[PDB]
Amino acid sequence: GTHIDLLFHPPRAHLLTIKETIRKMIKEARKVIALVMDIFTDVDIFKEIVEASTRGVSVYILLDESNFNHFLNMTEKQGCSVQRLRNIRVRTVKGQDYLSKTGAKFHGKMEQKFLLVDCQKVMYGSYSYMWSFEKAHLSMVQIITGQLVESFDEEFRTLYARSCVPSSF
Amino acid sequence: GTHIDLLFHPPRAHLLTIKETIRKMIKEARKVIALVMDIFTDVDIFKEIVEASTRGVSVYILLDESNFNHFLNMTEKQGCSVQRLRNIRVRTVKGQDYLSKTGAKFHGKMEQKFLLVDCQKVMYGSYSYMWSFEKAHLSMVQIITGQLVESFDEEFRTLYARSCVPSSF
Ligand SMILES: Nc1ccc(-c2ccc(CO)o2)cc1
Ligand SMILES: Nc1ccc(-c2ccc(CO)o2)cc1
């Protein structure tokens, strides 16, 4: 009991763009939005998420740690102190710890991108929320309903357990 | 009529790693292998592909254009002249053309990756074929069978039509 449709950017035969479909998914949220994202600088999508939170939807956002300052820089340019919105929680996730041949320890990246709404619908794929995915790159997503959604819910909870409050905050 | 399994790196409750499952998929190929990838420098996966082509399997590889010289350099360091293997065709795909802030003309990237074997099984997800995905990053893939695989076959053909002979050749 899993159904999957495919969408592309630039768009193919389907009516809506990927960005338009993300806005739709967010406006349709009744209870909860769970987002995992590597880089988030798109202001239009950010505005939709803030608007959802003001109507009482709980919003949980997991961002790649090494790219977090891109998001912070965007929210401050918009005049938003996101750390004051009680209905939104933002946390960061690191990759694996590894030691370089010059001995300096480093961590890698969380390479994972999905949007999970009301524990019932997922958008999963290669589209990141930044201007280069509108204008420059070719990407694709899946829209997923049914039994597979439960696996994305489990994986969200697992990343949430691992995540940390961002050090700026 | 689509079945989907998830695998993670580092691995969870599955017996094989993502890299071991990619090797398995290529060894099991009887007729055709179709690969779309952004960066390919993993020697062990390259060796499995060459071995499949010597068995008579037809191999089509589509690489992101900007990153192509990293692949060619790996093949040359292995002492292989990949140009001379007739059962493998390697071609490049570019993203969209666009103008920058200063008016200059650039192209973006093909942000897509998947492995399609015998028109019947797909591995789709965020794992790229390089050392950093083994040691540094967190990633995930889907193993897909059934009706959705036909959609990946159509998309491979569409990307193949767009693709170019690499300028380095
Ligand atoms: N001629 C042409 C134009 C665009 C694409 C396209 C959009 C998204 C993706 C990634 O699968 O490919 C393929 C071929
Ligand atoms: N504690 C812990 C360890 C590893 C992961 C992991 C690997 C790949 C992905 C992407 O979904 O997540 C999550 C939590």
How far is it, in rounded angstroms, from Cα A169 to Cα A92?
A: 11
Ligand 1 proximity of A138 Cβ (cutoff 6 Å): yes
Pairing label, strands B97-99, B105-107: antiparallel
With beta carbons less than 8 A apart as the criterion, state whether B112 and B36 touch: yes
What are the boundaries of each domain within chain A? 1-169
Structure tokens at A23: 């806005």
From the CB of residue A99, how many other CB atoms can be counted at a distance below 10 Å?
10
A151 lines ligand 2 (CB under 6 A): no
Secondary structure string (H, E, C) spanning chain B: CEEEEEEEECCCCCCCCHHHHHHHHHHCCCCEEEEEECCECCHHHHHHHHHHHHCCCEEEEEEECCCHHHHHHHHHHCCCCHHHCCCEEEEEECCCEEECCCCCEEECCECCCEEEECCCEEEEECCCECHHHHHCCEEEEEEEEECHHHHHHHHHHHHHHHCECCCCC
CB-nearest to B96 from A95, A106, A138 is A138
Structure tokens at A81: 């102190």
State the Cα–Cα distance between residues A34 and A150, nearest whole angstrom.
13
Cis amide linkage into residue A10, ω under 30° from 0: yes
Contacts of B69 (CB under 8 A, 6+ apart): B168
> Residue A56 in contact with residue A42, Cβ under 8 Å?
no
Q: How far is CA A109 from each of CA A36, A168, B17, rounded to the nearest angstrom?
A: 13, 19, 18
CA distance B46 to B28: 15
Pair of tokens at residue B54: 């010597």
The verdict on a CB contact (< 8 Å) between A135 and B110 is: no
Tell me which residue has its CA closest to atom 6 in ligand 1.
A138
Cα separation values, B79 from B42, B50, B51, B90, Å = 15, 13, 15, 17
CB neighbours of B129 closer than 8 A, spacing ≥ 6?
B22, B37, B39, B40, B41, B42, B45
Residue whose pair of structure tokens reads 């989907």 in the numeric block: B4
In whole angstroms, give the CA distance from residue A155 to residue A135: 31
Q: Are B112 and B92 spatial neighbours (Cβ–Cβ below 8 Å)? A: no
Displacement of CA A157 from its chain's centroid (Å): 14
Total residues found in chain B within this entry: 169
Mutate to test the pocket of ligand 2, among B17, B138, B140 (most ligand atoms within 8 A of CB): B138
Flag whether residue A161 sits within 8 Å of chain B, measured between CB atoms. Answer: no
CATH topology of domain B1-169: Endonuclease; Chain A (3.30.870)
| Alpha-carbon gap, residue A137 to A112, rounded angstroms | 18
DSSP state of A156: H
DSSP A29: -
Cis amide prior to B10 (ω within 30 degrees): yes
Under 8 Å between Cβ of B23 and B45: yes
Tell the burial category of A55 from Cβ atoms under 10 Å away from its Cβ (0-12, 13-18, 19+). exposed
B21 closest CA partner among B7, B3, B42, B1: B7
Q: Give the side-chain half-sphere CA count within 13 A for A61.
A: 26
What is chain B's alpha carbon radius of gyration, rounded to the nearest angstrom? Answer: 16
Angstrom distance (rounded) from CA B139 to CA B10 = 8
**For chain A, what is the total number of helices (H) and then of strands (E)?**
5, 9
Question: Closest ligand to B151 CA?
Answer: 1
Query: What are φ and ψ of residue B167, in 5° steps?
Result: -60, -35
* B110–chain A Cβ distance below 8 A for any pair: yes
Indicate if the alpha-carbon torsion angle B85, B113, A41, A67 is positive or negative: negative
* CA–CA separation, A131 and A113 (whole Å): 16
Coil, strand or helix at A23: helix
Q: Please say whether the beta carbons of A81 and A54 come within 8 A.
A: no
Q: Find all residues with CB under 8 Å of A45, minimum gap 6, and list them.
A: A19, A22, A23, A26, A129
Dihedral-angle region of residue A119 (phi above 0 means left; psi in -120 to 50 means alpha; beta otherwise): left
* CB contact at 8 A, A71 and A40: yes
Q: Find all residues with CB under 8 Å of A136, minimum gap 6, and list them.
A: B95, B96, B98, B106, B107, B108, B109
Q: How far is CA A39 from the centre of its chain?
A: 8
Q: Is the CB of B6 under 6 A from ligand 2?
A: no
Neighbours of A73 (CB within 10 A): 11
Backbone angles phi, psi at B133, to 5 degrees: -75, -20
CA dist A153 and A115 (Å) reads: 10
Quote the CA–CA distance of A114 and A94 in Å, as a whole number.
16
